[model samples]
Target: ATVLLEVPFSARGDRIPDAVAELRTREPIRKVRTITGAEAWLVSSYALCTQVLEDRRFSMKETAAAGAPRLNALTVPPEVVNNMGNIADAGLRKAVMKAITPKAPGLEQFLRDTANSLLDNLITEGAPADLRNDFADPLATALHCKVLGIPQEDGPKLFRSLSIAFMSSADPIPAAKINWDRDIEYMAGILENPNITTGLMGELSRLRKDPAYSHVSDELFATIGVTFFGAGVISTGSFLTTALISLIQRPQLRNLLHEKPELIPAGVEELLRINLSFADGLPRLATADIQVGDVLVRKGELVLVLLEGANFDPEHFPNPGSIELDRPNPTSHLAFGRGQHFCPGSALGRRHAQIGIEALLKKMPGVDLAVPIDQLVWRTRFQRRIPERLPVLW
Candidate 1:
């Protein structure tokens, strides 16, 4: 008799479970149960995972449809599932994208300066510092605040909303709603403020009054501010935190990057390809009967795309576990996902990490974990795989 396997195989970002590779080899598309106690198809091979992400028939928005088999409860409202689509429909997509670009004037410099300053503080505080709390997360919060034109001091208050905002749970979270409503009110106030005249929210505030965008709802204006801030902070913070772990674990690679800082970009790409930041698989609901591997996924069924499955598949990435900077198809990994729903903040994310890593290596070339790997507590039932307190020393 076969027992049903749960969706998240493990939460440790430091290591990929052996079962992931075993399943990829044995059953690339297999059945599993989600936190919501609903059946889902767990796609575990590079080819199948790519197919699901590339096909529009598998919809991220429709995953929120009533009675749909869910990967987890909605942290935001059901409509927020199609956030990018909503932005496009509101004609704010171009403005939003431009605002988040790493190439924005002074943005890269801001990141570099911010990273250095954070490292300086960590150095002063002395050894056994928590990289996650003191460095990566603060950098992320600060960068988002700059990018959003929000006050730096207000970042922590907005950031407090995320622990509940990004929850992956079986039932609706009451605290999630409380934080969402409060954040929305805060964002709405930002849009109305006369002094807020820069960054994404500034542009949005101007658009709100223009005849061209007057019809756009106040709710959407506020939602964009809250959503972008939360998403960017969470994603960048988690990725950089885990990427630091990846770099620290490999002293040879860390030294190589420290010696040749120009290779940081390439190293960052390799790190992205190997990052296990996302704890659970990316979920989408099928809108049509799609042929994926051996399974015929019917409309309304949920599909979980196992990123590590695609990322660590030896077939696509030869010697997948190793962080090879010279791979021919370097940017082919689904780290930012694929097709319509690909990550918008990817360039910003890459720059955040590259700058963060560069600064850390320059400041503390000997950075390594202070405690044994197993002794670090991992955040479980959360959106990302990160150690609770990344205690480290140089």
Candidate 2:
């Protein structure tokens, strides 16, 4: 079939793209072409998305394999791709999972402290501040470093590398290569820090000594930093910005957040669902013949699970169009995705956002949009929902 619609359809109007909604209603599973010209199955329903994700027949490792479907032509370095299977290993998964699991009294305390510390600066700056770049971006980077036990001092440089690493085709390859190499170096240096503690990088340290991980290089261990960089900063910043925008625009919701602190957890989940920051479907390769909705995704076929659309599938979520903070199954949405490659950083992202949003609402109770919501500008990045700036006033 010809391209159904271009991806990253206007998110500002109606939130969910009209194209995605129409496809979900008429042809839940449709053949579509990504903006980058890759042809793939666009799965729009919630049930099929879950099925494709949970079944081992769909593989993330193969997405980067030769001729795989991609939203962009830019390629990820080998260090990044090499560690893709690490999470599939039982022991390695446990160690990596420990860093982001949100288990300690220390976790909550640190997140709160960090949020407030950043909020202090945000408030002191007074009105007309860009929250996305000034507050949200910085806080996301800081929290990412904090979770990985990276020193606060290195956060800026690390974030720069991350920013450069996500550069598009227009960006010079030589420049990207230089930045990518430096990014690996920066992460490698973090592992060697004398004060490095029992975080993910630290866990990688211990794992290296074990015979099982002897084959993995220190360079591969450092890839964890880059992974955290993307997960922690790009998507995290987008969601934080969107979550705050939702609160500021809706007075009733904002008031509820202020009146009932306990509701913050569920509120964050609902925000995650409605203002989802992921811009497109996740890419996966069909390992074998599989049923995707009514159609068969043949072996070696590429599949793009339209997460944003699937999460709003009316079958899985009634009243999916509305943002219900108290929704019974808000977390059921596949915002961070599902199955084996499901985000390991899900716990960390949830807790960090919950604490950060709560702290902001409590501390800056009067914060509001400096400009009209309609005037706010959104970025055009594929596979990411980001605002150019979220200027706000107290």
Candidate 3:
């Protein structure tokens, strides 16, 4: 079989749609090449992807026991060991489990207020607001920093600093080393801060006040912050931008949403499921040797999940191409991820998204394209799939 080596390949109108079409009859896991010099299995089926995510056999360290399956500019060393494994605690148990925790009951109230306030500001400024750059980014950054008690001004700057840490793609220096250096500098500044008061840092101090959790203070703070940067601004901003664009393009969904205000919550699910942000699948490495479907993932090999393919799988998702506003089991969807490494911030992401959408829909009507869709620029230089700036009108 002639497998294409370039990622974001041509068969993308339905990314991995062809691959998925093949998988409905056969199995989904199959060997594929990527832009980076590497060959590995791409898992398309949600069932199999879930299994892969949950299965402990895919340890990050042992996957590279020999040489890694492929080398990318961004593959890091610590990422090689326990990149997503840090969240396997009783507090959550698999990776990304922390993000999904509906803990901190105060969160929804916080998000609702914060989002409303931000949207209010944007609305006051009047028409032609770039929601992605102006609204979503600041809202997410501020919320994350505020919750953790980091300084507000430092939130955006820290976001930039933390980017060096989580961003993949290696250069003269490996992405891991570069990221690690960036993290050290960030942590040093946090340590020196005199007035962080009641955020994650403050909580760390509180937890340390207890005998059992003192050792965990730094660990918790660091882990939370690292995860925050990686998952925080990206999902909220990306989804809001996509939803606004989608509504502008397809007024039917917007009309439906407007008529049935009750659908806002469920609308969030459909929008996320239909316009899922991640194009690159979660990266998983083979611990030893494993066979997914018929394709073999050799030890040390990296596999890309191709989530959009899985979520849009026709066999798995009936009328998959069409968005169903009232899908019953939204939990079954992989939007927040499945098994280990499921997003911890899933709840927060959803709440804020709902607020942003409600705000957008209420404030802007007869919203149309400021420019041709063909001419719109997609910001894809990083792991995030976004439209950089989403502009809308009254």
Candidate No. with top TM-score = 1
Per-residue lDDT over 1-394 for candidate 2, one digit per residue giving the tens place of the 0 to 100 score: 6636666566562266667778888987888767667778888888888888899888877776766666555546642553647645424666776677778548778777877887788778777788888878887887777777777787888777654455433223566678777777887887777678756777777777789888776766887777777657777777888889888877788888888989999888888887667666777889899877789999888788888777888888888877786667778989888887777778877887888888888887888899877787766553466677898887
lDDT of 1 by residue, 40-126 (tens): 999989999999999998899998899999889898999999999999999999999999999888888999999999899999989
TM-score per candidate, chains pooled: 0.99, 0.91, 0.83
Cα-based RMSD of the predictions, in order? Answer: 0.8, 2.5, 3.9
lDDT of 1 at 86: 93
Error of 2 at 27 (Å): 1.0
Error of 1 at 74 (Å): 0.8
Each prediction's whole-model lDDT (CA): 0.94, 0.75, 0.62
Model 2 has how many clashing residue pairs?
A: 0
Tell me how far candidate 1 lies from the true structure as C-alpha RMSD in angstroms.
Answer: 0.8
Model 2 residue 83 distance off true place after TM-score fit, in angstroms:
2.9
